[PDB]
Design a binder for this molecule. Structure first.
Ligand code: SF4
Lengths: 290, 628
């Protein structure tokens, strides 16, 4: 299975999970039931950026699966791969929205789940200033808790805002990593779809700071690529869904670095086994100056 | 039918009609319906019992020549002789280059300009370098290269980029190369009356001969030219007939051998010659190149390219060419007649290529610079005979970027290498983009023009289709010059013609979507590149999604090139049918059975859009075989 086929398989799995969870939400709560994220002004940010539509009820959430379906075209060309990554991102957002409408408190501490607009505005000032020179999106599991803690604290000591997805949260807790918004170590959630909660940070950064109106998807992608200094460090074995989510990160212009053997793409998808050089490799790949 | 897609070509054809001079198009029209027997390859003249012609349609008419040779035998022998002639042309070019290398000296006209390249080549030839004088090394390297041409005992020396698997496959098949002249002689011997009358064996002998061109003759010529005249790097130039200057002396270098054109370029900066050009009433000296010698001087110095093969006559039709200096190969003899209608001095310089009624000034290899200065002085003095009322230079020229040797490509690829990962100075970024599928493949577009095809149409259509399908294109020779004239050799072309993956790659690496890798002998560079990629991936060259295209080929050299490209394991599309349709067995060998032998085969397709589609499908199926 080559890179394109891996991304397409991951996007289809994300679509299947989104369809299942949306069906569950439709069964339990009804199509008139409200759909929203806590304290946001852009409804579902990824769908709002891609199309301009605001998802307000469960029926519209079910109708948002058509966006995911239309973004998956299985032809081995780079544009289709980027669109398939975006389909995975939209599907992950739909899954998170369904989680919020199904459970009153989908995320428990230390996971924070969705990040509200006021937090985005608070982080915007140090973002453009340079006190936050980048965003380290750490996903998966490191071979040890010690190495995960070392990498996370290396990013933290450099001022980067690091977000954690997956078992790396538990490894960092075992590694005595101090977490919080002021400590710049944000645990999003144990599921892969929780990575969308940092993706919407970039998307809304284009909506708030950039002033790009909703539906101008190419302008949003250009803004995230040229303004948001985010990158992905994917540790541990990578499923097709993880690779598809990484394709979404690449579609947003965010390079993906991993310790796994993957079909490398220069400046976009890079393998770095040496955990002692992963921080420097990511800073170089994202062109970050400390 | 239109004669060309190039507007400057069309304006000069109108001028040639107004001037009452004949062109290659006019002679093609005069030839009318060409002989069917010769077109199918079923005519034989190998002995004076003939001429013999057998039916191109099996089961009808005369079946055998007088000696009993079948249509397949006649076709296979004719094809083999074309391969032998092409191999001879390329090998003679490389032999001259090696002899020039052998005569290099510190204080002479010919020096060593790339010592690192010479040391790497010496490593490839098992020549010691440590603690040695550079010219002693150069002479030893030249001796080894010369031995490759005529050794009768032992094995020849092949470049390290050639995969071990490909060599083992050649040895098992029986096509492993011997000395170049020996293989040419073997082909000529086996086509003699009453020798080889088996099509498969004949084709295998021709493949064996073509390998000595691709991997020994052209390769050594290219690498020694780099050693003596400098490795090409990315450089700007201008292309098409508009580069001629009305108010300057115009000196057009046509042919293939680079030593003469290098010495002419050096002589053009001589203060006495510049002063002489001023004194004859010209603003200066304007050197322009055509065909492969133009490609060489343009790759290494940015000399403007006046035009490719079927434009050579039109260069004279402008009435502005004060001197036309030619060495060997692809020099239309009609130029001698044509220059009578203008003031142009048509100067032959090589004992290998005498042309009747041209001015012969033998280029002296013993004193190359002085000889080049004398020839250039004749061209400059001819400026006084210019008739400015007969001058018409089209205001049509195009910016081009070239100089993409393998070394230059590797240097460009270093830009997209993460320093914390590495390694540097490899083809690894290219291998990565090919394996990931961001690039679907790489295609080489090579070859001449041919009056049978609208000039430059097939080259341009094939190149645009390939780059639109995210296939990166490397170009050589007259195809490269067609791309230069059209405007494809530009960074802007990436966003104008390329597909998404290739546009992203071009933006990241800062290269045009079409890479000009030099002259016809520089096709060896392409081989080198492919080999490196294969050696990096641990596979044979037949496992890669690569292809070669000759949309508008005419020469025996093109036949030899396609043969050795296929024998190396690279599928080749021919835009002009070779004279083999009369032999069904030969057609079946070249287009079907060759894949069993060397993993690649010929594709005959005269429609460029269909050729692009077939190339994409073949690359995709090879990718699926490879798992990428
Ligand atoms: S070699 Fe045979 S087929 Fe050819 S001309 Fe002589 S007799 Fe005829």
């Amino acid at each position: 299975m080559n890179l394109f086929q891996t991304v397409f398989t991951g996007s289809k799995q994300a679509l299947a999970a989104a369809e299942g969870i949306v069906k569950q939400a439709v069964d339990e709560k009804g199509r008139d039931y409200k759909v929203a994220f806590p304290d946001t002004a852009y409804s579902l940010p990824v769908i709002f950026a891609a199309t301009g539509k605001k998802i307000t009820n469960v029926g519209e959430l079910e109708g948002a699966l058509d966006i995911v379906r239309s973004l998956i075209v299985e032809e081995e060309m780079l544009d289709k791969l980027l669109n398939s990554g975006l389909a995975t991102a939209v599907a992950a957002e739909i899954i998170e929205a369904a989680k919020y409408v199904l459970s009153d408190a989908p995320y428990a501490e230390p996971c924070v789940g969705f990040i509200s607009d006021p937090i985005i505005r608070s982080l915007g000032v140090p973002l453009v200033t340079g006190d936050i020179p980048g965003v380290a999106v750490i996903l998966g599991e490191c071979p040890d808790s010690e190495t995960a803690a070392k990498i996370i604290k290396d990013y933290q000591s450099k001022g980067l805002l690091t977000c954690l997805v997956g078992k790396v949260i538990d490894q960092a807790i075992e590694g005595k990593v101090k977490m919080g918004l002021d400590l710049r170590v944000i645990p999003l959630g144990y599921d892969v779809t929780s990575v969308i909660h940092v993706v919407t940070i970039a998307i809304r950064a284009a909506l708030i700071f950039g002033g790009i109106k909703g539906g101008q998807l190419n302008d949003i992608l250009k803004y995230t690529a040229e303004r948001v200094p985010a990158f992905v460090n994917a540790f541990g074995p990578l499923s097709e869904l993880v690779v598809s989510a990484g394709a979404g990160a690449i579609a947003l212009g965010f390079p993906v670095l991993t310790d796994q053997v993957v079909p490398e793409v220069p400046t976009l998808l890079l393998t770095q086994k040496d955990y002692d050089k992963m921080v420097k490799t990511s800073l170089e790949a994202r062109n970050i100056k400390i | 039918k239109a004669k060309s897609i190039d507007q400057a070509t069309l304006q000069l054809l109108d001028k040639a009609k107004q001037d009452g001079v004949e062109t290659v198009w006019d002679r093609k029209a005069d030839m009318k319906v060409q002989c069917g027997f010769g077109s199918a390859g079923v005519c034989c003249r190998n002995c004076s019992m003939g001429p013999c012609r057998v039916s191109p349609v099996p089961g009808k008419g005369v079946e055998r020549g007088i000696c009993g040779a079948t249509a397949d035998v006649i076709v296979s022998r004719n094809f083999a002789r074309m391969v032998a002639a092409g191999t001879a042309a390329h090998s003679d070019h490389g032999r001259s280059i090696a002899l020039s290398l052998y005569h290099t000296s510190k204080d002479g006209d010919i020096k060593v300009k790339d010592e690192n390249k010479l040391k790497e080549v010496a490593k490839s030839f098992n020549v010691e370098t440590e603690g040695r004088d550079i010219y002693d090394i150069a002479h030893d390297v030249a001796k080894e290269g010369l031995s490759n041409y005529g050794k009768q005992l032992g094995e020849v020396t092949l470049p390290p980029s050639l995969p071990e698997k490909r060599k083992e496959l050649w040895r098992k098949l029986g096509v492993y190369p011997r000395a170049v002249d020996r293989e040419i002689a073997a082909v000529m011997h086996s086509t003699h009356i009453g020798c080889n009358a088996d099509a498969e064996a004949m084709i295998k002998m021709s493949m064996r001969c073509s390998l000595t061109d691709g991997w020994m003759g052209s390769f050594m010529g290219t690498e020694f030219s780099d050693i003596m005249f400098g490795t090409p790097h990315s450089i700007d130039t201008e292309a098409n007939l508009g580069v001629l200057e009305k108010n300057s002396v115009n000196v057009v270098l046509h042919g293939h051998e680079p030593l003469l054109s290098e010495m002419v370029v050096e002589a053009a900066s001589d203060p006495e010659l510049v002063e002489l050009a001023k004194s004859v009433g010209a603003d200066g000296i304007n050197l322009c190149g055509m065909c492969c010698t133009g490609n060489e001087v343009s790759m290494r110095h940015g000399i403007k390219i006046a035009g490719n093969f079927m434009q050579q006559e039109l260069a004279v039709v402008t009435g502005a060419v004060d001197g036309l200096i030619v060495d060997v190969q692809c020099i239309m003899p009609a130029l001698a007649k044509l220059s009578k209608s203008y003031h142009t001095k048509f100067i032959t310089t090589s004992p290998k290529a005498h042309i009747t009624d041209s001015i012969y000034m033998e280029f002296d290899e013993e004193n190359p610079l002085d000889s080049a200065k004398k020839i250039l002085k004749e061209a400059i003095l001819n400026f006084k005979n210019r008739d400015q009322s007969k001058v018409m230079i089209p205001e049509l020229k195009c910016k081009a970027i070239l100089g993409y040797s393998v070394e230059e490509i590797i240097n460009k690829l270093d830009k997209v290498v993460n320093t914390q990962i590495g390694p540097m100075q490899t083809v690894k970024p290219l291998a990565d983009v090919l394996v990931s599928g961001v690039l679907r493949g790489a295609a080489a577009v090579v070859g001449c023009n041919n009056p049978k095809v609208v000039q430059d149409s097939a080259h341009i259509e094939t190149i645009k289709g390939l780059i639109k399908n995210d296939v990166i294109v490397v170009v050589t020779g007259c195809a490269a010059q067609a791309a230069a004239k059209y405007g494809l050799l530009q960074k802007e072309a990436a966003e104008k013609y390329a597909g998404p993956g290739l546009a992203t790659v071009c933006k990241l690496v800062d290269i045009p979507p079409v890479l000009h890798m030099g002259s016809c002998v520089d096709i060896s560079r392409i081989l080198d590149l492919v080999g490196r990629v294969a050696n990096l991936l641990g596979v044979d060259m037949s496992d890669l999604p690569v292809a070669g295209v000759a949309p508008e080929w005419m020469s025996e050299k093109a036949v030899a090139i396609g043969t050795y490209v296929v024998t190396s394991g690279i599928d080749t599309w021919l835009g002009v049918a070779p004279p083999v349709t009369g032999g069904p067995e030969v057609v079946d060998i070249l287009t079907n059975k060759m894949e069993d032998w060397v993993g690649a085969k010929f594709f005959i397709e005269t429609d460029p859009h269909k050729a692009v589609e077939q190339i994409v499908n073949r690359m995709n199926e090879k990718r699926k075989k490879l798992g990428i």
